[PDB]
Amino acid sequence: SKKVLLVDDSAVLRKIVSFNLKKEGYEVIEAENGQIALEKLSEFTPDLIVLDIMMPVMDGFTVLKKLQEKEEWKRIPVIVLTAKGGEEDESLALSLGARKVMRKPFSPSQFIEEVKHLLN
C-alpha cells in the first residue's frame, strides 16, 4: 500500500487532495508546511510527495532542494501543485528536477492519473 506525503498549507485544497488519494487506496501523511514535512521525512520514506507551491511559496523550494541533495530522497517522485503567475516557480520546480506539475483550477482525475503514472 503506497504512502504519499502531502505538503499543503491550504487546508481546503489539502482536504480535497487527501480524499482523492485515500479513495484510490493510498496512505496519506500530511504536513502543513516545509518544516513539518522535513521532520516527518527523518522518520519515514514515502513513495510519492505532493508539494503545493502556491505563492507565497514560503519554504516549498527549500524542501524541493533538500530532497535533491539527499541520496535517500532524490529518487522519491514529486508532484508540485502550481498556480497562475508562478510560471517562474514552475520552470524551477521542473528544473529543481521534479517530476511533474499539476495546476489549478483543480482536476481530481488529472491529478490521480499523474499519481498513477508516477507510482508505476
- The closest of 53, 50, 110 to 76, measured between CA atoms, is 50
Question: Entry resolution in angstroms?
Answer: 2.0
Query: Do the annotations mark residue 9 as ligand-binding?
Result: yes
* Structure-determination approach: X-ray
Q: How far is 22 from 77, CA to CA, in rounded Å?
A: 18
Nearby residues of 96 by Cβ (< 8 Å), 6 or more positions away: 61, 64, 65, 68
Residue 47 burial by Cβ neighbours in a 10 Å radius (0-12, 13-18, 19+): middle
Q: How far is 108 from 88, CA to CA, in rounded Å?
A: 24
Residue ranges of alpha helices (H) inside the chain are: 11-23, 34-41, 60-69, 87-95, 108-118
74: three-class secondary structure by DSSP: coil
Q: Determine the structural domain holding residue 113 and report its residue range.
A: 1-120
Number of domains in the chain: 1
Query: Do the annotations mark residue 59 as ligand-binding?
Result: no
Q: How far is 48 from 36, CA to CA, in rounded Å?
A: 16
Query: Do the annotations mark residue 89 as ligand-binding?
Result: no
Grid cell listed for 79: 508532484
CATH of the domain at 51: 3.40.50.2300
Nearby residues of 109 by Cβ (< 8 Å), 6 or more positions away: none
Q: How far is 94 from 109, CA to CA, in rounded Å?
A: 21
